[PDB]
Amino acid sequence: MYLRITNIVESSFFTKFIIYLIVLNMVTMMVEKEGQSQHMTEVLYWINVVFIILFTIEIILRIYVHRISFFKDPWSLFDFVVVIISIVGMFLADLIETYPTLFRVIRLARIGRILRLVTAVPQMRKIVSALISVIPGMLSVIALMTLFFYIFAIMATQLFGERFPEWFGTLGESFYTLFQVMTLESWSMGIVRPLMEVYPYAWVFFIPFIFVVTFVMINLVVAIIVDAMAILNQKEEQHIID
Amino acid sequence: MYLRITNIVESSFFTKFIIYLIVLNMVTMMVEKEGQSQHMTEVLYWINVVFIILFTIEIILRIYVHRISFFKDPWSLFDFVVVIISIVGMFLADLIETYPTLFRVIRLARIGRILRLVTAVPQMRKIVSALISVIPGMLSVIALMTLFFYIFAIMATQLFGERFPEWFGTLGESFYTLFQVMTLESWSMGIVRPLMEVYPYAWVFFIPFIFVVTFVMINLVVAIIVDAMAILNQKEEQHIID
Amino acid sequence: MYLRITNIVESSFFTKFIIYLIVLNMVTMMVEKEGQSQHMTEVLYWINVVFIILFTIEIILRIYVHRISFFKDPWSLFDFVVVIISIVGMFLADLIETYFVSPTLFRVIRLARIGRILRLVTAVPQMRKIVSALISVIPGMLSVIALMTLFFYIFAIMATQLFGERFPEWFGTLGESFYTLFQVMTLESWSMGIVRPLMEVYPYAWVFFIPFIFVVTFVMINLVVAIIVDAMAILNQKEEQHIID
């Protein structure tokens, strides 16, 4: 009896069917506009509840097989946190709408159901993991970039923030404009040149910020290149020996 | 008329002369403007018909020398699709002109004869396939980047698709702005800063979107290097034997 | 004598405690608002006074325990130059605040407070490592940086000549032309903002800016390739050493 239910759960079909189910939930979410139709909203929402119930049947079948060993594997554990959030959230969203800004934000909880398309599917799972593994080597370079931003963010508010509060009022505004100056999005035409009307020697803060930022950025990417080449030459080196 | 032609087609004269015919068909396609002059349109359209005729003459000679073995080659197969699409397009466009916006959309079939420059030039052939061989390795990273775009796209409509339909109303409408924000083109001054007039904490969607997409970007570029470094080191590894 | 002090200053706890103060002084420098109110501005000013005192006390112990070693160490003198800057600044900014003179002189002079905070790139370890491993790169690309500046001159001497007459706001001065050519280099509004309105007056302006972008991008790409090949030289020239045995 149970060996047939476990045969079906720990199956080549079952995985492919759950992948398919998530893919179709994504399609029922992809067909959402601003229009929309008071009817369409009632239509789409129910097809999602058709999914939420099937995805709770999905984890109930999968918790039946693993009993308490389900909590051990974080994959099984993630699928459970996604399922509880879909449920806790769909009822929270229905509740809010019945009695504003919160409704559209709270309605986000549905993303976990389709986010499982990086998790539940292998090949993708592999690329997500192999990419995440880069971050710790960068964590030092990342930390200095954050640390450098604080010095400049304290300076910007101090220096310009009086006449330019729209960009450098609080350290919050200051951090944002600097990141934008860093991404080089309208740094001059939009931010530095109008600053040079009030303060002609404003570039003395931004031109070096651009240089310092770009330098740290260049070294970060180069470190990933060289870290990939360090492990590549390591296997190449021992092969040569004999 | 099969004994002498078999050797003239597989000659330096025939391949160089046919490459010359393409260059001359590019120049005639270039000397087109918005102007234009109806006489200039009639003259240029006729110069093209001569080349469309000449390139048909070319493929007939190429078919009846290689007999059926012509169709084995995917390159000769392409050069054949080029002439049929050119001939079909020639009359398809003319039928519409004689009997407005569809006429422009159809007329780009003329590019087929000009696209042959990469495939026909035996060196341009090489640089193209050297770039093609890169893509299989990238396919993993792309698929993940595509899916991340979908999640961020479904979110953008749900969050800001209502009040800002010009950039986020539809899924595809949202997909476009996310690509514009990815290329970092006017992401802050033109999109995120005006979005924060309505939604003050909108930056907590776009800055985390920037990082997610840029990290994946860096890694793809880094991957193209490592993939090509396995080429330098492998021809060096076999050389280090003697 | 003084061995109990020699154990406090230059230890593990004391080393860590100074980081804690540097970090706590950053958080009070993070309370900078657009407002700000006569109360809050003076409140913040006084909190910093306390920190400046603590940091002067901090360098007093440091130079006493390592009497001759202070001058030999470069990082030990940085924390000293910062102390003498923080002290000079404190009263120099106060002098301009008391004697009501240009907020422009005050806002610029108050920028000495930053020294107390940029100590985090020094004082806390691994941060000193990263910043030093980054600074070590700067010479192994200094010729490319030098070539770039020279390339910028030649191009700025040209831009002021050609476009400077009808476009003074962007190219009227060599200082104006050094700015615009830098903006064009970062590709920010290069065409729409500068090269396109220039073509309204001088339609063959692109013949200068398209090659400028090219000449200036090639030098840039190679500067980054130089950082890679020099990093991959330390790896490659040690790889050979092991292979030899």
Next chain:
Amino acid sequence: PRGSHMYLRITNIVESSFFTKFIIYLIVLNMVTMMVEKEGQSQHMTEVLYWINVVFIILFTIEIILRIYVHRISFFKDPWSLFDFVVVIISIVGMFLADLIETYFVSPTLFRVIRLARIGRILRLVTAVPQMRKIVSALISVIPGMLSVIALMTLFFYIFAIMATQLFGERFPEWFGTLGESFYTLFQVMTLESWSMGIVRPLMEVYPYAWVFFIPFIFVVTFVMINLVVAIIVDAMAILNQKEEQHIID
């Protein structure tokens, strides 16, 4: 008699440290005068600056005539020495040709173009000072390999440029009117400067499926570009793997 004493004494002056370091000084000194010309600026300041430059023009002519008698046809075989002479003949022609257009006040627009000859004098700074000529030659040695990717990139621009003019040429002649116009706008779109907020979005009011031409263009160009930058790395790693190779042979 010999007779050859002076032509072996003058080579000790021309092929020395002082001369070389002094000629590098003269170019730097000629740069600062060219640097101080701006917005406008009286005919006094303009004549003052013009005369300082004439002095500099003859100063480099004596320098090349010194090298002319010493190295002779051995200077001709050197490209850096040949170019130095080309600069001199340009800084002289230019000096007169610009003055001619100033005397007979016909074409004030052609004047600023011809007057650009003066840049040859300070253009020589990268080739004169060593280590700068080193890197210049090192960068110049990167472009030959790179050449085939560039040739492909150019071709991709020709096919995309004949396409842009064909489609959005009638309603938007401002950007894609002529073939040459399309080349510029597609380069702007490639460099990503206001590609959407400025060009692809307004184009979508008229032709709403216009992005189907630009998104692939932005992909294709960026794909060829990345591979070009990656090629520079592989062109550079050809040096490292070969020097290491012979060392391991023994």
